[model samples]
Target: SMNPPPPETSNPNKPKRQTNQLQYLLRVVLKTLWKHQFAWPFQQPVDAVKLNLPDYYKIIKTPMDMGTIKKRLENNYYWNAQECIQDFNTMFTNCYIYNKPGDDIVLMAEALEKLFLQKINELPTEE
Candidate 1:
């Protein structure tokens, strides 16, 4: 199966672009981050709360393939920036938990911020 459908033709609009590469990567990263989060040392499964957020187990245990990733993002809901930040912040928290120097936390924060901004730029602009 085509991972990304190609552009459309003007001849009676025969079919159309199925998925934007940027959107696909965004979903992949979000799901990857969730998986990475709980991958911590002997972490417990994710728990679903009242919010639309999927339970940790739901996010953590799912397959990392494109289809599964896309389904989770759409079926569950839009992934928010706040949750991303929270996870990034918790990475620093792990630094403290592991008794590592603060430098690693700072580096991780900066790296993620840079990547997030870069990825946002890759998204398609509004019409």
Candidate 2:
């Protein structure tokens, strides 16, 4: 379970301050990457708003590594549903947004995009 609460202490005479590294990482990733404006890749709402629905839905509906996601969520103070969704959206949108840069080269022009699409298609979905 990814519950944030620390374990209960058995001894009344002893005090304990329990912490989980997982939760710490979750917090840091969320706050540092999602909330702050100075981070890399930029939190450009303009870019996000213009995302194509097919691309966005494909990413959103894709299966993520929940075990890893849980680990990430548990390790940070910034874990939340919204941030997770947004992160997924941004990564998928940005990675293949442009149709590749070239009007020439028949094979190379769309090669990378096809590869990316194949990988996305191969992604494991949540059951």
Candidate 3:
């Protein structure tokens, strides 16, 4: 039921001209984020029960991570490139909220944030 092979006019004709958004700079930045040493905490979703952080769910509701973001990017889930970047920001925001000030993961999150911003700015505006 998936493959309708023919000349495709049924596709709604994506309006955003996404080649500029997803193809070049974002993929490259995503790769760098994945490779960052401090990216360990952010590489996957947090398992609240497995980690024994019973209150994690109470402190943070919206969860995110590098893998999920990458998956969404591959799936064409983000209509705007800015939303994709926002997901990364939310991932860090969750860390800052769930962890105390002294937590080492907070530092890692901030470190990655700085790196992300640096790279994010390298690309042109998502206009």
Candidate 4:
């Protein structure tokens, strides 16, 4: 089976978008964050009940994790980089609130956050 020849000329009024590159850039940053050394703690949602830390939800009202982030990315849940970065911030900020300042999770999220900042340094202007 052969696919038909691709043609962008068929659509005249349509302005081609660079969203393809944006998607790739986001994917790269996300994958690198996951591959980082201190990304484990935020990789999945916290189980406050199992861990006997019932106060977790009380302290952290809104929760975001890497697992959910990835799903959101794949499902096109984020409209732009702002929303995506907000998710990371939410997860890391929640880490700070739920866990003590000098704890392990705080240190890990701090590291990952630095990477996150670095990754998002370059972004595309709306076309």
Candidate 5:
């Protein structure tokens, strides 16, 4: 869960703080990214006004194994949702900003294709 409240202690009246950021990242930041800025590649202009239905799962599940995402979400800084958001924002900017337009698009497509291929390869072979 994103920004999950920490486990309650003795004080029942204590206002719980948001200790995880997966919620914010998924619900707020990611929604904004898919809906506003990065529109799909197409001939007709499909305004990026809503989350791209076909690609939402791909965006979330794309396996870029950076140790930081897990590290920030759990372990010592598990309570620091701010750190996670900041890290995500920085990564998003770097991936899109610094790379050339075609290069970034090609790279992302290749990564997705690789993931798909790997999944396909894992299926049982017919006799």
Candidate 6:
């Protein structure tokens, strides 16, 4: 049997990178903070960030991998595939979420739920 074609690629140059369940949870934490007035809406809204929930979930569930992620970012590191993933797990991709103010917690939670479900649907097919 054959499967359908995958979705179109949005970023041509970049590989398909995604975080695990735990990392997604972390992203939820950050996003929630922003949504709860702990962070600015304009500053950290879903549209304002390119949060890869999968990566955040990986961080929250399996934090042990954080060491490997940290080592990769050591003293004088430049960049790599994993490097692209490191910040996805943290609350402050560019700035702290707790610093902003005025957000919609209800909407944010709804959006997060929708996003998490969407990502769960994207998990590799178990052949």
Q: Which stretches of model 1 miss by more than 4 angstroms? A: 1-25, 28-74, 79-102
Winner on TM-score between 2 and 6 is: 2
Q: Largest lDDT belongs to which candidate? A: 3
The model with the greatest TM-score is: 3
- lDDT of all predictions, in order shown? 0.38, 0.35, 0.71, 0.71, 0.37, 0.34
Query: Candidate 2, residues 52-95: lDDT per residue as tens digits?
Result: 33444333333222233433354442224444444444443443
Report model 6's TM-score to 2 decimal places.
0.25
Candidate 5 lDDT by residue in tens digits, 23-120: 44434443333343222331112222352345323343322212444333333333444544455444444444434566855466344334434433
Regions of candidate 2 where Cα sits further than 4 Å from its true position: 1-19, 38-52, 58-127
Task: Tell how far residue 69 is off in model 1, in angstroms.
Answer: 11
lDDT by residue for model 4 over 9-66, one digit each (tens)?
2343543333643485457778989988888777777777667777777777777788
Listing every candidate in turn, what is its Cα RMSD in Å to the true structure after a full C-alpha superposition? Answer: 13.5, 14.7, 8.5, 11.6, 16.1, 16.2
The alpha-carbon lDDT assigned to residue 82 of candidate 5 equals 51
lDDT for 45 (candidate 6): 25
For model 6, give the RMSD to the true fold: 16.2
Ranking by lDDT: 3, 4, 1, 5, 2, 6
- Give the per-residue lDDT of model 3 (tens digit) for 6-117: 1111234544335566654357777888888998777777866677777776677677788777766665655677777778888989898888886899888888888888
* lDDT per residue as tens, model 6, 12-125: 454433334334333543244335433343232232124433333323332222223333223222223334234333423222232233345435434543553454444443
lDDT of the structure predicted as candidate 6: 0.34
- Per-residue error for 111 in candidate 3, Å, reads 1.1
